[PDB]
Write a protein that holds these residues in place. Structure first.
Motif, PDB file in Angstrom:
ATOM      1  N   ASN A  65     -50.684 -29.882 -23.332  1.00 45.37           N
ATOM      2  CA  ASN A  65     -52.190 -29.730 -23.499  1.00 45.37           C
ATOM      3  C   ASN A  65     -52.733 -28.236 -22.852  1.00 45.37           C
ATOM      4  N   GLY A  66     -51.733 -27.513 -22.858  1.00 42.31           N
ATOM      5  CA  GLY A  66     -51.871 -26.018 -22.832  1.00 42.31           C
ATOM      6  C   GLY A  66     -52.271 -25.708 -21.382  1.00 42.31           C
ATOM      7  N   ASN A  67     -51.934 -26.731 -20.464  1.00 46.86           N
ATOM      8  CA  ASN A  67     -52.164 -26.390 -19.067  1.00 46.86           C
ATOM      9  C   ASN A  67     -50.934 -25.809 -18.481  1.00 46.86           C
ATOM     10  N   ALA A  68     -51.076 -24.816 -17.222  1.00 49.02           N
ATOM     11  CA  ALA A  68     -49.974 -24.014 -16.599  1.00 49.02           C
ATOM     12  C   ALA A  68     -49.398 -25.451 -15.906  1.00 49.02           C
ATOM     13  N   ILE A  69     -47.750 -25.115 -16.068  1.00 48.60           N
ATOM     14  CA  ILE A  69     -46.755 -25.700 -15.158  1.00 48.60           C
ATOM     15  C   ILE A  69     -45.691 -24.768 -14.796  1.00 48.60           C
ATOM     16  N   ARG A  70     -45.315 -25.281 -13.541  1.00 45.55           N
ATOM     17  CA  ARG A  70     -44.110 -24.143 -12.923  1.00 45.55           C
ATOM     18  C   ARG A  70     -42.875 -24.846 -13.390  1.00 45.55           C
ATOM     19  N   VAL A  71     -42.062 -23.784 -14.051  1.00 39.98           N
ATOM     20  CA  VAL A  71     -40.637 -24.473 -14.501  1.00 39.98           C
ATOM     21  C   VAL A  71     -39.509 -23.666 -13.899  1.00 39.98           C
ATOM     22  N   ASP A  72     -38.260 -23.919 -13.674  1.00 35.93           N
ATOM     23  CA  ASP A  72     -37.432 -23.204 -13.126  1.00 35.93           C
ATOM     24  C   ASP A  72     -36.910 -22.109 -14.051  1.00 35.93           C
ATOM     25  N   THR A  73     -36.940 -20.854 -13.582  1.00 38.63           N
ATOM     26  CA  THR A  73     -36.147 -19.794 -14.507  1.00 38.63           C
ATOM     27  C   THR A  73     -34.761 -19.909 -15.094  1.00 38.63           C
ATOM     28  N   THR A  74     -34.668 -19.431 -16.537  1.00 35.88           N
ATOM     29  CA  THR A  74     -33.330 -19.741 -17.008  1.00 35.88           C
ATOM     30  C   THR A  74     -32.447 -18.655 -16.518  1.00 35.88           C
ATOM     31  N   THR A  75     -31.207 -18.892 -16.346  1.00 37.42           N
ATOM     32  CA  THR A  75     -30.308 -17.790 -15.923  1.00 37.42           C
ATOM     33  C   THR A  75     -30.169 -16.787 -17.151  1.00 37.42           C
ATOM     34  N   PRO A  76     -30.221 -15.592 -16.627  1.00 36.88           N
ATOM     35  CA  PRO A  76     -30.254 -14.391 -17.755  1.00 36.88           C
ATOM     36  C   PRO A  76     -28.819 -13.911 -18.267  1.00 36.88           C
ATOM     37  N   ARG A  77     -28.894 -13.254 -19.233  1.00 36.79           N
ATOM     38  CA  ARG A  77     -27.802 -12.446 -19.836  1.00 36.79           C
ATOM     39  C   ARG A  77     -27.824 -11.048 -19.477  1.00 36.79           C
ATOM     40  N   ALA A  78     -26.737 -10.555 -19.077  1.00 33.47           N
ATOM     41  CA  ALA A  78     -26.685  -8.962 -18.603  1.00 33.47           C
ATOM     42  C   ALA A  78     -26.913  -8.002 -19.797  1.00 33.47           C
ATOM     43  N   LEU A  79     -27.937  -7.025 -19.723  1.00 33.88           N
ATOM     44  CA  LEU A  79     -27.869  -6.443 -20.684  1.00 33.88           C
ATOM     45  C   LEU A  79     -26.953  -5.365 -21.339  1.00 33.88           C
ATOM     46  N   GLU A  80     -26.125  -5.256 -22.286  1.00 35.98           N
ATOM     47  CA  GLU A  80     -25.264  -4.529 -22.697  1.00 35.98           C
ATOM     48  C   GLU A  80     -25.663  -3.264 -22.716  1.00 35.98           C
ATOM     49  N   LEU A  81     -24.762  -2.184 -22.323  1.00 32.67           N
ATOM     50  CA  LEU A  81     -24.994  -0.714 -22.291  1.00 32.67           C
ATOM     51  C   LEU A  81     -25.760  -0.264 -23.368  1.00 32.67           C
ATOM     52  N   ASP A  82     -25.486  -0.560 -24.736  1.00 30.44           N
ATOM     53  CA  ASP A  82     -26.040  -0.261 -25.887  1.00 30.44           C
ATOM     54  C   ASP A  82     -27.619  -0.509 -26.160  1.00 30.44           C
ATOM     55  N   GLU A  83     -27.784  -1.460 -25.144  1.00 33.25           N
ATOM     56  CA  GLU A  83     -29.062  -2.258 -25.019  1.00 33.25           C
ATOM     57  C   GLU A  83     -30.409  -1.657 -24.524  1.00 33.25           C
ATOM     58  N   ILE A  84     -29.840  -0.739 -23.508  1.00 38.97           N
ATOM     59  CA  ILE A  84     -30.619  -0.009 -22.754  1.00 38.97           C
ATOM     60  C   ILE A  84     -31.600   0.871 -23.317  1.00 38.97           C
ATOM     61  N   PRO A  85     -31.171   1.962 -24.333  1.00 35.70           N
ATOM     62  CA  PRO A  85     -32.017   2.785 -24.980  1.00 35.70           C
ATOM     63  C   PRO A  85     -32.913   1.667 -25.784  1.00 35.70           C
ATOM     64  N   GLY A  86     -32.749   0.753 -26.098  1.00 32.36           N
ATOM     65  CA  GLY A  86     -33.910  -0.065 -26.851  1.00 32.36           C
ATOM     66  C   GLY A  86     -35.133  -0.453 -25.762  1.00 32.36           C
ATOM     67  N   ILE A  87     -34.641  -0.818 -24.481  1.00 29.05           N
ATOM     68  CA  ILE A  87     -35.613  -1.137 -23.485  1.00 29.05           C
ATOM     69  C   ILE A  87     -36.540   0.110 -23.416  1.00 29.05           C
ATOM     70  N   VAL A  88     -35.892   1.174 -23.289  1.00 30.34           N
ATOM     71  CA  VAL A  88     -36.597   2.376 -22.678  1.00 30.34           C
ATOM     72  C   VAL A  88     -37.620   2.608 -24.108  1.00 30.34           C
ATOM     73  N   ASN A  89     -37.330   2.558 -25.358  1.00 32.80           N
ATOM     74  CA  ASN A  89     -37.913   2.730 -26.512  1.00 32.80           C
ATOM     75  C   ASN A  89     -39.258   1.878 -26.531  1.00 32.80           C
ATOM     76  N   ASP A  90     -38.919   0.481 -26.003  1.00 34.36           N
ATOM     77  CA  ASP A  90     -39.931  -0.340 -25.999  1.00 34.36           C
ATOM     78  C   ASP A  90     -41.253  -0.120 -25.011  1.00 34.36           C
ATOM     79  N   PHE A  91     -40.652   0.584 -23.961  1.00 32.93           N
ATOM     80  CA  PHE A  91     -41.756   0.982 -23.010  1.00 32.93           C
ATOM     81  C   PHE A  91     -42.660   2.135 -23.539  1.00 32.93           C
ATOM     82  N   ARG A  92     -41.880   3.138 -24.291  1.00 32.37           N
ATOM     83  CA  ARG A  92     -42.397   4.032 -24.824  1.00 32.37           C
ATOM     84  C   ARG A  92     -43.360   3.679 -26.010  1.00 32.37           C
ATOM     85  N   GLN A  93     -42.792   2.690 -26.759  1.00 33.38           N
ATOM     86  CA  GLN A  93     -43.829   2.365 -27.953  1.00 33.38           C
ATOM     87  C   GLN A  93     -45.216   1.442 -27.332  1.00 33.38           C
TER      88      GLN A  93
END
Ligand SMILES: Cc1cc2nc3c(=O)[nH]c(=O)nc-3n(C[C@H](O)[C@H](O)[C@H](O)COP(=O)(O)O)c2cc1C
Ligand SMILES: C[C@]12C=CC(=O)C=C1CC[C@@H]1[C@@H]2C(=O)C[C@@]2(C)[C@H]1CC[C@]2(O)/C(O)=C/O
Length: 364
Positions: free
Chosen positions: A137-165
Protein backbone atom coordinates in the motif's frame (compact mmCIF):
# COMPACT_ATOMS: atom_id res chain seq x y z
CA UNK A 1 17.07 37.12 20.19
CA UNK A 2 19.54 34.84 21.99
CA UNK A 3 23.05 36.21 21.43
CA UNK A 4 25.14 34.83 18.54
CA UNK A 5 22.74 32.31 16.98
CA UNK A 6 21.32 35.04 14.78
CA UNK A 7 24.55 36.48 13.39
CA UNK A 8 25.97 35.78 9.89
CA UNK A 9 28.53 33.08 9.13
CA UNK A 10 30.60 32.49 6.01
CA UNK A 11 30.17 28.82 5.05
CA UNK A 12 32.45 28.05 2.14
CA UNK A 13 31.04 29.62 -1.02
CA UNK A 14 27.92 31.03 0.65
CA UNK A 15 27.01 33.23 3.61
CA UNK A 16 24.42 32.06 6.14
CA UNK A 17 22.49 34.91 7.81
CA UNK A 18 22.19 32.93 11.04
CA UNK A 19 23.67 29.84 12.72
CA UNK A 20 20.44 27.86 13.03
CA UNK A 21 20.81 25.09 10.46
CA UNK A 22 18.35 22.41 9.40
CA UNK A 23 19.93 18.98 9.86
CA UNK A 24 19.66 16.30 7.16
CA UNK A 25 16.37 14.49 7.76
CA UNK A 26 15.31 11.34 5.95
CA UNK A 27 11.51 11.51 5.50
CA UNK A 28 11.00 8.75 2.89
CA UNK A 29 8.32 10.46 0.80
CA UNK A 30 9.90 10.22 -2.66
CA UNK A 31 8.19 8.72 -5.69
CA UNK A 32 8.89 5.11 -6.65
CA UNK A 33 9.74 3.95 -9.21
CA UNK A 34 12.55 6.43 -9.77
CA UNK A 35 13.29 7.65 -6.23
CA UNK A 36 12.11 11.05 -7.42
CA UNK A 37 11.74 14.19 -5.27
CA UNK A 38 8.17 15.56 -5.27
CA UNK A 39 6.42 18.94 -5.31
CA UNK A 40 5.36 18.19 -1.72
CA UNK A 41 9.02 17.83 -0.76
CA UNK A 42 9.62 21.12 -2.56
CA UNK A 43 6.99 22.81 -0.40
CA UNK A 44 8.44 21.28 2.77
CA UNK A 45 11.89 22.69 2.04
CA UNK A 46 10.51 26.05 0.93
CA UNK A 47 8.67 26.38 4.26
CA UNK A 48 12.04 26.06 6.03
CA UNK A 49 14.04 28.40 3.78
CA UNK A 50 14.75 30.87 6.60
CA UNK A 51 17.25 28.38 8.05
CA UNK A 52 20.85 29.62 8.02
CA UNK A 53 21.45 26.58 5.83
CA UNK A 54 19.19 23.71 4.88
CA UNK A 55 20.95 20.34 4.66
CA UNK A 56 18.77 17.94 2.67
CA UNK A 57 17.63 14.45 3.58
CA UNK A 58 20.25 11.83 2.68
CA UNK A 59 20.24 11.33 -1.09
CA UNK A 60 21.57 8.41 -3.20
CA UNK A 61 24.68 8.88 -5.33
CA UNK A 62 23.61 5.83 -7.36
CA UNK A 63 20.86 3.20 -7.48
CA UNK A 64 23.21 0.80 -5.65
CA UNK A 65 23.46 3.39 -2.86
CA UNK A 66 19.77 2.94 -2.02
CA UNK A 67 18.94 1.43 1.36
CA UNK A 68 15.46 2.82 2.15
CA UNK A 69 12.26 2.84 0.12
CA UNK A 70 11.24 6.46 -0.38
CA UNK A 71 14.70 8.02 -0.14
CA UNK A 72 15.57 10.26 -3.12
CA UNK A 73 18.46 9.96 -5.52
CA UNK A 74 20.62 12.43 -7.45
CA UNK A 75 21.88 10.16 -10.22
CA UNK A 76 19.12 10.19 -12.85
CA UNK A 77 17.84 12.91 -15.21
CA UNK A 78 14.41 12.81 -13.58
CA UNK A 79 15.92 13.24 -10.11
CA UNK A 80 18.10 16.13 -11.26
CA UNK A 81 15.07 17.82 -12.83
CA UNK A 82 13.01 17.43 -9.66
CA UNK A 83 15.79 18.65 -7.37
CA UNK A 84 16.24 21.68 -9.66
CA UNK A 85 12.70 22.77 -8.83
CA UNK A 86 13.29 22.23 -5.12
CA UNK A 87 16.51 24.28 -4.95
CA UNK A 88 14.84 27.03 -7.00
CA UNK A 89 12.02 27.11 -4.46
CA UNK A 90 14.47 27.54 -1.60
CA UNK A 91 16.36 30.24 -3.49
CA UNK A 92 13.13 32.07 -4.34
CA UNK A 93 12.83 32.53 -0.57
CA UNK A 94 16.45 33.66 -0.29
CA UNK A 95 17.59 30.47 1.44
CA UNK A 96 20.59 28.17 0.96
CA UNK A 97 20.52 24.40 0.54
CA UNK A 98 23.11 21.64 0.64
CA UNK A 99 22.43 18.12 -0.55
CA UNK A 100 23.55 15.33 1.76
CA UNK A 101 24.91 12.48 -0.37
CA UNK A 102 25.15 8.89 0.82
CA UNK A 103 25.68 5.27 -0.07
CA UNK A 104 23.90 3.19 2.57
CA UNK A 105 26.15 0.18 2.15
CA UNK A 106 25.04 -2.71 4.36
CA UNK A 107 22.06 -0.80 5.78
CA UNK A 108 19.92 -1.92 2.86
CA UNK A 109 17.82 -4.80 1.54
CA UNK A 110 18.24 -6.91 -1.59
CA UNK A 111 14.68 -6.13 -2.72
CA UNK A 112 15.59 -2.51 -3.44
CA UNK A 113 19.05 -3.14 -4.91
CA UNK A 114 19.68 -3.32 -8.67
CA UNK A 115 18.74 -6.80 -9.87
CA UNK A 116 17.50 -7.70 -6.39
CA UNK A 117 21.05 -8.61 -5.39
CA UNK A 118 22.80 -8.30 -2.03
CA UNK A 119 24.01 -4.82 -1.00
CA UNK A 120 27.71 -3.97 -0.67
CA UNK A 121 29.97 -2.98 2.22
CA UNK A 122 33.58 -3.03 3.40
CA UNK A 123 33.11 -6.61 4.60
CA UNK A 124 30.43 -9.31 4.45
CA UNK A 125 28.88 -8.53 7.83
CA UNK A 126 25.18 -7.93 8.44
CA UNK A 127 24.23 -4.53 9.88
CA UNK A 128 21.95 -6.30 12.37
CA UNK A 129 19.27 -3.62 12.22
CA UNK A 130 16.05 -2.95 10.30
CA UNK A 131 15.79 -0.56 7.37
CA UNK A 132 12.57 0.91 5.99
CA UNK A 133 10.81 -0.51 2.93
CA UNK A 134 7.27 0.04 1.61
CA UNK A 135 4.42 -2.47 1.74
CA UNK A 136 1.87 -3.16 -1.00
CA UNK A 137 0.00 0.00 0.00
CA UNK A 138 3.06 2.24 -0.10
CA UNK A 139 3.32 2.50 3.68
CA UNK A 140 6.68 2.39 5.46
CA UNK A 141 7.58 -0.91 7.13
CA UNK A 142 10.68 -2.04 9.04
CA UNK A 143 12.54 -5.05 7.61
CA UNK A 144 15.80 -6.77 8.63
CA UNK A 145 18.84 -5.71 6.62
CA UNK A 146 20.31 -8.11 4.06
CA UNK A 147 23.81 -9.49 4.65
CA UNK A 148 26.17 -7.59 2.32
CA UNK A 149 28.83 -8.61 -0.16
CA UNK A 150 32.32 -7.22 0.43
CA UNK A 151 33.35 -4.78 -2.29
CA UNK A 152 36.16 -6.13 -4.47
CA UNK A 153 39.27 -3.94 -4.63
CA UNK A 154 38.60 -3.12 -8.29
CA UNK A 155 35.12 -1.86 -7.36
CA UNK A 156 36.36 0.93 -5.10
CA UNK A 157 37.23 3.38 -7.91
CA UNK A 158 33.65 3.05 -9.11
CA UNK A 159 32.31 4.08 -5.71
CA UNK A 160 34.57 7.13 -5.71
CA UNK A 161 33.36 8.02 -9.20
CA UNK A 162 29.72 7.72 -8.15
CA UNK A 163 30.30 10.31 -5.41
CA UNK A 164 32.12 12.52 -7.94
CA UNK A 165 29.29 12.23 -10.47
CA UNK A 166 26.64 12.93 -7.84
CA UNK A 167 28.44 16.13 -6.85
CA UNK A 168 28.63 17.16 -10.50
CA UNK A 169 24.87 16.54 -10.63
CA UNK A 170 24.34 18.54 -7.44
CA UNK A 171 26.02 21.53 -9.06
CA UNK A 172 23.71 21.35 -12.08
CA UNK A 173 20.70 20.85 -9.81
CA UNK A 174 21.34 24.21 -8.18
CA UNK A 175 22.56 23.10 -4.75
CA UNK A 176 24.77 25.58 -2.90
CA UNK A 177 26.89 22.94 -1.18
CA UNK A 178 27.18 19.19 -0.78
CA UNK A 179 27.51 17.25 2.46
CA UNK A 180 29.20 13.86 2.30
CA UNK A 181 27.47 11.37 4.60
CA UNK A 182 30.43 9.81 6.37
CA UNK A 183 28.47 9.06 9.55
CA UNK A 184 25.82 6.89 11.19
CA UNK A 185 27.04 3.50 10.00
CA UNK A 186 26.53 4.02 6.28
CA UNK A 187 29.10 3.03 3.64
CA UNK A 188 31.85 5.55 4.35
CA UNK A 189 31.53 4.98 8.10
CA UNK A 190 31.47 1.21 7.47
CA UNK A 191 35.01 1.56 6.11
CA UNK A 192 36.07 3.95 8.89
CA UNK A 193 35.04 1.60 11.71
CA UNK A 194 37.07 -1.48 12.73
CA UNK A 195 33.81 -3.12 13.85
CA UNK A 196 32.48 -3.18 10.28
CA UNK A 197 35.75 -3.30 8.36
CA UNK A 198 37.74 -6.54 8.42
CA UNK A 199 39.51 -6.01 5.09
CA UNK A 200 43.09 -7.16 4.63
CA UNK A 201 43.92 -4.88 1.71
CA UNK A 202 44.87 -1.20 1.80
CA UNK A 203 41.32 -0.24 2.78
CA UNK A 204 41.35 -2.05 6.12
CA UNK A 205 43.44 -2.22 9.26
CA UNK A 206 45.14 1.01 10.33
CA UNK A 207 43.18 4.23 10.65
CA UNK A 208 45.06 5.47 7.58
CA UNK A 209 43.67 2.53 5.61
CA UNK A 210 40.19 2.80 7.12
CA UNK A 211 39.99 6.50 6.20
CA UNK A 212 41.44 5.94 2.72
CA UNK A 213 38.06 5.67 0.99
CA UNK A 214 36.44 8.75 2.50
CA UNK A 215 39.55 10.83 1.79
CA UNK A 216 39.67 9.59 -1.82
CA UNK A 217 36.04 10.68 -2.09
CA UNK A 218 36.80 14.09 -0.57
CA UNK A 219 39.64 14.63 -3.05
CA UNK A 220 37.49 13.53 -5.98
CA UNK A 221 34.60 15.88 -5.16
CA UNK A 222 36.87 18.83 -4.38
CA UNK A 223 38.46 18.35 -7.80
CA UNK A 224 35.08 17.91 -9.50
CA UNK A 225 33.60 21.12 -8.11
CA UNK A 226 35.47 23.21 -5.53
CA UNK A 227 36.63 22.65 -1.95
CA UNK A 228 34.53 25.56 -0.72
CA UNK A 229 31.41 23.69 -1.88
CA UNK A 230 32.19 20.57 0.15
CA UNK A 231 31.03 19.71 3.64
CA UNK A 232 31.21 16.38 5.46
CA UNK A 233 29.27 14.80 8.30
CA UNK A 234 30.96 12.42 10.70
CA UNK A 235 29.89 10.67 13.91
CA UNK A 236 33.39 9.65 15.16
CA UNK A 237 32.67 9.36 18.89
CA UNK A 238 30.37 6.66 20.24
CA UNK A 239 28.24 4.03 18.53
CA UNK A 240 25.73 4.67 15.75
CA UNK A 241 23.34 2.08 14.35
CA UNK A 242 25.56 -0.74 15.66
CA UNK A 243 28.76 0.77 14.27
CA UNK A 244 31.22 1.99 16.90
CA UNK A 245 34.43 3.90 16.24
CA UNK A 246 36.97 1.44 17.58
CA UNK A 247 39.18 1.39 20.73
CA UNK A 248 41.03 4.60 19.77
CA UNK A 249 38.10 6.70 18.58
CA UNK A 250 39.43 10.05 19.81
CA UNK A 251 42.87 9.72 18.23
CA UNK A 252 41.39 8.28 15.02
CA UNK A 253 38.90 11.15 14.88
CA UNK A 254 41.65 13.75 15.13
CA UNK A 255 43.62 12.00 12.39
CA UNK A 256 40.62 12.13 10.05
CA UNK A 257 39.92 15.76 10.92
CA UNK A 258 43.52 16.81 10.32
CA UNK A 259 43.41 15.08 6.93
CA UNK A 260 40.13 16.78 6.04
CA UNK A 261 41.58 20.16 6.99
CA UNK A 262 44.35 19.70 4.42
CA UNK A 263 41.70 19.83 1.68
CA UNK A 264 40.37 23.19 2.87
CA UNK A 265 36.74 22.09 2.66
CA UNK A 266 33.79 24.29 3.63
CA UNK A 267 32.69 22.58 6.81
CA UNK A 268 32.91 19.76 9.33
CA UNK A 269 29.54 18.58 10.67
CA UNK A 270 29.80 16.58 13.88
CA UNK A 271 26.88 14.33 14.81
CA UNK A 272 27.50 13.89 18.52
CA UNK A 273 24.85 11.37 19.51
CA UNK A 274 22.58 8.76 18.01
CA UNK A 275 18.85 8.91 18.77
CA UNK A 276 19.47 6.77 21.87
CA UNK A 277 21.87 7.51 24.72
CA UNK A 278 25.33 8.97 24.05
CA UNK A 279 28.36 10.21 26.00
CA UNK A 280 28.73 14.04 25.89
CA UNK A 281 31.75 15.58 24.15
CA UNK A 282 34.31 16.94 26.60
CA UNK A 283 35.33 20.57 26.17
CA UNK A 284 38.89 19.29 25.85
CA UNK A 285 37.95 17.14 22.86
CA UNK A 286 36.04 20.02 21.28
CA UNK A 287 39.21 22.11 21.64
CA UNK A 288 41.29 19.41 19.96
CA UNK A 289 38.84 19.37 17.06
CA UNK A 290 38.68 23.17 16.80
CA UNK A 291 42.45 23.66 16.55
CA UNK A 292 42.69 21.08 13.76
CA UNK A 293 39.99 22.34 11.38
CA UNK A 294 40.00 25.79 9.79
CA UNK A 295 36.54 25.79 8.28
CA UNK A 296 33.06 25.99 9.76
CA UNK A 297 32.22 23.47 12.48
CA UNK A 298 28.59 22.43 12.90
CA UNK A 299 27.48 20.68 16.08
CA UNK A 300 24.43 18.41 16.17
CA UNK A 301 22.61 15.90 18.35
CA UNK A 302 19.83 16.76 20.80
CA UNK A 303 21.05 20.36 21.00
CA UNK A 304 19.25 23.03 22.98
CA UNK A 305 19.45 26.68 21.91
CA UNK A 306 21.24 27.39 25.18
CA UNK A 307 23.86 24.74 24.47
CA UNK A 308 24.36 26.16 20.98
CA UNK A 309 24.90 29.67 22.34
CA UNK A 310 27.27 28.36 25.00
CA UNK A 311 29.53 26.52 22.57
CA UNK A 312 29.43 29.20 19.87
CA UNK A 313 30.24 31.80 22.51
CA UNK A 314 33.19 29.70 23.65
CA UNK A 315 34.48 29.63 20.08
CA UNK A 316 34.29 25.84 19.88
CA UNK A 317 31.66 25.53 17.13
CA UNK A 318 30.18 27.96 14.59
CA UNK A 319 26.66 26.68 14.00
CA UNK A 320 24.16 24.10 15.18
CA UNK A 321 22.00 21.76 13.12
CA UNK A 322 18.57 21.02 14.59
CA UNK A 323 16.74 17.93 13.44
CA UNK A 324 13.41 17.15 15.05
CA UNK A 325 12.72 20.76 16.00
CA UNK A 326 12.99 21.61 12.30
CA UNK A 327 10.59 18.82 11.39
CA UNK A 328 7.98 20.42 13.65
CA UNK A 329 8.84 24.12 13.20
CA UNK A 330 9.35 25.45 9.68
CA UNK A 331 10.13 28.89 11.11
CA UNK A 332 12.39 27.62 13.88
CA UNK A 333 14.70 30.62 13.40
CA UNK A 334 11.94 33.13 14.15
CA UNK A 335 10.66 31.07 17.08
CA UNK A 336 14.10 30.84 18.67
CA UNK A 337 14.72 34.54 18.06
CA UNK A 338 11.41 35.56 19.66
CA UNK A 339 11.64 32.86 22.34
CA UNK A 340 8.27 31.54 21.18
CA UNK A 341 6.90 28.11 22.04
CA UNK A 342 7.41 25.33 19.49
CA UNK A 343 4.89 23.04 17.81
CA UNK A 344 4.74 19.58 19.39
CA UNK A 345 6.48 16.78 17.49
CA UNK A 346 4.52 13.89 15.96
CA UNK A 347 7.11 11.09 15.54
CA UNK A 348 4.58 8.72 14.00
CA UNK A 349 4.81 10.70 10.76
CA UNK A 350 8.58 11.19 10.62
CA UNK A 351 8.90 8.44 7.99
CA UNK A 352 6.74 7.89 4.93
CA UNK A 353 3.18 8.99 4.32
CA UNK A 354 2.24 12.34 2.84
CA UNK A 355 1.50 15.93 3.82
CA UNK A 356 0.33 15.04 7.33
CA UNK A 357 3.20 15.50 9.76
CA UNK A 358 5.30 16.95 6.94
CA UNK A 359 3.99 20.31 5.61
CA UNK A 360 1.46 20.09 8.47
CA UNK A 361 3.32 22.12 11.08
CA UNK A 362 2.25 25.78 11.10
CA UNK A 363 4.53 28.79 11.08
CA UNK A 364 3.88 31.73 13.40
C1 LIG B 1 13.39 11.41 11.21
C2 LIG B 1 14.94 11.57 11.20
C3 LIG B 1 15.62 11.45 10.02
C4 LIG B 1 17.08 11.65 9.99
N1 LIG B 1 17.71 11.57 8.82
C5 LIG B 1 19.02 11.79 8.75
C6 LIG B 1 19.74 11.79 7.50
O1 LIG B 1 19.22 11.59 6.50
N2 LIG B 1 21.05 11.91 7.52
C7 LIG B 1 21.82 12.15 8.72
O2 LIG B 1 23.00 12.33 8.62
N3 LIG B 1 21.15 12.15 9.91
C8 LIG B 1 19.84 12.04 9.96
N4 LIG B 1 19.15 12.16 11.15
C9 LIG B 1 19.86 12.79 12.27
C10 LIG B 1 19.64 14.30 12.26
O3 LIG B 1 20.37 14.96 11.24
C11 LIG B 1 20.01 14.93 13.63
O4 LIG B 1 21.46 14.87 13.82
C12 LIG B 1 19.25 14.31 14.78
O5 LIG B 1 17.83 14.51 14.56
C13 LIG B 1 19.60 14.68 16.21
O6 LIG B 1 19.24 16.04 16.48
P1 LIG B 1 17.85 16.53 17.11
O7 LIG B 1 17.82 16.18 18.57
O8 LIG B 1 17.97 18.08 16.93
O9 LIG B 1 16.71 15.95 16.33
C14 LIG B 1 17.75 11.91 11.24
C15 LIG B 1 16.98 11.98 12.43
C16 LIG B 1 15.59 11.90 12.47
C17 LIG B 1 14.82 12.08 13.72
C1 LIG C 1 17.52 8.36 11.94
C2 LIG C 1 18.37 7.44 11.08
C3 LIG C 1 19.77 7.60 11.72
C4 LIG C 1 20.85 8.13 11.02
C5 LIG C 1 20.75 8.59 9.61
O1 LIG C 1 21.68 9.05 9.05
C6 LIG C 1 19.44 8.44 8.98
C7 LIG C 1 18.32 7.93 9.58
C8 LIG C 1 16.90 7.82 8.81
C9 LIG C 1 16.40 6.47 9.09
C10 LIG C 1 16.37 5.97 10.40
C11 LIG C 1 17.81 6.03 11.11
C12 LIG C 1 17.74 5.39 12.57
O2 LIG C 1 18.19 5.98 13.72
C13 LIG C 1 17.12 3.98 12.50
C14 LIG C 1 15.76 3.92 11.91
C15 LIG C 1 14.78 4.69 12.90
C16 LIG C 1 15.85 4.51 10.49
C17 LIG C 1 14.43 4.13 9.91
C18 LIG C 1 14.03 2.93 10.52
C19 LIG C 1 15.17 2.53 11.50
O3 LIG C 1 16.30 1.80 10.80
C20 LIG C 1 14.87 1.69 12.78
O4 LIG C 1 13.57 1.56 12.89
C21 LIG C 1 15.53 0.78 12.86
O5 LIG C 1 15.52 0.46 14.25
Amino acid sequence: SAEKLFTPLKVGAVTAPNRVFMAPLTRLRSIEPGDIPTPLMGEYYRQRASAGLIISEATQISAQAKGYAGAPGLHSPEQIAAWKKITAGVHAEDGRIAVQLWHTGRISHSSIQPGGQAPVSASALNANTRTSLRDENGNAIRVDTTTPRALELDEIPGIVNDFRQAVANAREAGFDLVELHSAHGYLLHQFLSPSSNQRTDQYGGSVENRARLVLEVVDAVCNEWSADRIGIRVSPIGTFQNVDNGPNEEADALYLIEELAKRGIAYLHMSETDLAGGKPYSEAFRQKVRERFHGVIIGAGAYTAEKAEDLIGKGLIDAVAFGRDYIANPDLVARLQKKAELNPQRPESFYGGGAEGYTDYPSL
